[PDB]
From a paper:
In this study, we investigated a donor who developed a family of potent HIV bnAbs with different lengths of an insertion in a critical framework region following infection with two founder viruses that were closely related and underwent extensive recombination. Ab crystal structures show an extended CDRH1 that can help stabilize the CDRH3.
(b) Ribbon representation of PC39-23D Fab with 11aa CDRH1 insertion. Structures of all three 11aa-insertion Fabs reveal an extended CDRH1 that provides support to and stabilizes the long 22aa CDRH3 (Kabat numbering) of the lineage. The glycine at position G100C found in the WIGEL motif is present in the UCA and only retained in 11aa-insertion Abs. This sequence provides a glycine hinge to the unique mature bnAb CDRH3 structure. A triad of Trp residues are located in the binding site of these antibodies; Trp residues are present in both of the CDRH1 insertions (11 and 4aa groups), but do not appear to be close enough to directly interact with the Trp residues found in either CDRH3 motif (100AWIG(E/D)L100E or100AWWAVE100E) (S12(B) Fig).
Residue numbers in the entry:
A (entry chain L): -1 to 27, 27A, 28 to 95, 95A, 96 to 213
B (entry chain H): 1 to 31, 31A, 31B, 31C, 31D, 31E, 31F, 31G, ...
The structure:
């Protein structure tokens, strides 16, 4: 190719306030440190430049942020995390080779003990069925870490392509995540089948947990 | 300090063209003097987007010379133009699809190797950002939501905790707001981010968990407001026989 790509690690770094965070960036080609930049992104806010041009801090960036590296391997260090530092961080090659691509991001989240989700399944409401569509909802409540797998089965048949997931930001009181998975069927398809099940895999679960209902029972 | 003010319609129909503009404040594009610091010739007026669930993506840039550089993944769908006399620059992205739904930022890129006095921090980076425009690719017209209950049942409450919620379906544009019991019920509530469905309409759910016994002693009502359509809904969520 004719572009430089940057790969960040780890995908998620889980730490406590006061700890040191070390974020890595590997470029696919050598990049001078003159041209390697780092950014912070906090949900709901515009990205912020942290570091650029041979590891220099941008305006307003406090001393706990520093950077290092050469060749293809770069590091952003936060010496002591503050609560406002839990955010997503991006490296970028900026100034030697267009396009000026970013890495894929590293999220720094708040470490806590593993917590399995509580799982709940909801049938389509009779109100909604009066229309032409059925939504079946599976709720994974208050789990940690974020990685989780939800599979839908209809009459024991694995579903694919007809569901969508949404996930909350980490909770400010208990540091967990919550997730919804919504299965969308036509009313006609919904009324043709009996057993609706969501099956959840998570590090906090010894084996997968299935919640199910039988339509009309 | 220099700021970027973003404008332009974020709502684009599939296959049509997105047009966004930023205006520069606190500096001017037509001032060719260079008396201190870095030359305004070293600013590259840039566009960056973030699609949902993805990272930051560099779209391209323009200098007041008129020279552009574009991401090769776009490049004949993308045009960037600058209007030096108006302190403005613009992004046109044609033939949009749902993959182009994203927050679009403009930003000032800086590339200097010469300067007068002290080189301000932020060189060889995107140091000033606009606040972003959320762009939604959809054919939809304004539409208020339907609000359906996510009701607890005997099977789901048998561990001592009940979940209950509201499915807020098929509305456009963003946002809705959701409260429970007129704002009195906040603990254990999770209102999920909306998803832009393939229909071009949004959907989300809001849930709460409570002790199962409180289903016998407490009423639960979700309060849904969609200002764009002047829609307000209160939906009582009852245990389902």
């Amino acid at each position: 190719v004719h572009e430089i790509v940057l790969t960040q690690s780890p995908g998620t770094l889980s730490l406590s306030p006061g700890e040191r965070a070390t974020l890595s960036c590997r470029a696919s080609q050598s990049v001078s440190s003159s041209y390697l930049a780092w950014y912070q992104h906090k949900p709901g806010q515009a990205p912020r430049l942290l570091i650029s041009d041979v590891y220099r801090r941008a305006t307003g960036v406090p001393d706990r942020f520093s950077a290092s590296g050469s060749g293809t391997d770069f590091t952003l260090t936060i010496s002591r995390l503050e609560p406002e530092d839990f955010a997503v961080y991006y490296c970028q090659q900026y100034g030697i080779s267009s396009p000026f691509n970013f890495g894929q991001g590293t999220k720094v989240d708040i470490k806590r003990t593993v917590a399995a989700p509580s799982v709940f399944i909801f049938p389509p409401s009779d109100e909604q069925l009066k229309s032409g569509t059925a939504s079946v909802v599976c709720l994974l409540n208050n789990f940690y870490p974020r990685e989780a797998k939800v599979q839908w089965k209809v009459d024991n048949a694995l579903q694919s392509g007809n569901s969508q997931e949404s996930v909350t930001e980490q909770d400010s009181k208990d540091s967990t995540y919550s997730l919804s998975s919504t299965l969308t069927l036509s009313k006609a398809d919904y009324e043709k089948h009996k057993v609706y099940a969501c099956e959840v895999t998570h590090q906090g679960l010894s084996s997968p947990v299935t919640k199910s209902f039988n339509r009309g029972e | 300090q220099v700021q970027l003010k973003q404008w332009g319609a974020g709502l684009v129909k599939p296959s049509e063209t997105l047009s966004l503009t930023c205006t520069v404040h606190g500096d001017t594009l037509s001032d060719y003097s260079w008396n201190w610091g870095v030359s305004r010739s070293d600013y590259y007026w840039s566009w960056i987007r973030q699609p949902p669930g993805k990272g930051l993506e560099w779209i391209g840039e323009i200098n007041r010379s008129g020279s552009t550089q574009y991401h090769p993944s776009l490049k004949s769908r993308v045009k960037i133009v600058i209007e030096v006399s108006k302190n403005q620059f613009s992004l046109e992205l044609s033939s949009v699809t749902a993959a182009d739904t994203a927050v679009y930022y403009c930003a000032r890129g800086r590339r200097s190797r010469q300067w007068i006095g002290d080189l301000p921090p932020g060189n060889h980076g995107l140091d000033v950002w606009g606040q972003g425009i959320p762009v939604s690719v959809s054919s939809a017209s304004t539409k208020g939501p339907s609000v359906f209950p996510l009701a607890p049942s005997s099977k789901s409450t048998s561990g001592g905790t009940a979940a209950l919620g509201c499915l807020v379906k098929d509305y456009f544009p963003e946002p809705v707001t959701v409260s429970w019991n007129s704002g009195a019920l906040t603990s254990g509530v999770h209102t999920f981010p909306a998803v832009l469905q393939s229909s071009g309409l949004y959907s989300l759910s809001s849930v709460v968990t409570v002790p199962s016994s409180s289903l016998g002693t407490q009423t639960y009502i979700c309060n849904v407001n969609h200002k764009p359509s002047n829609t307000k809904v209160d939906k009582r969520v009852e245990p389902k026989s």
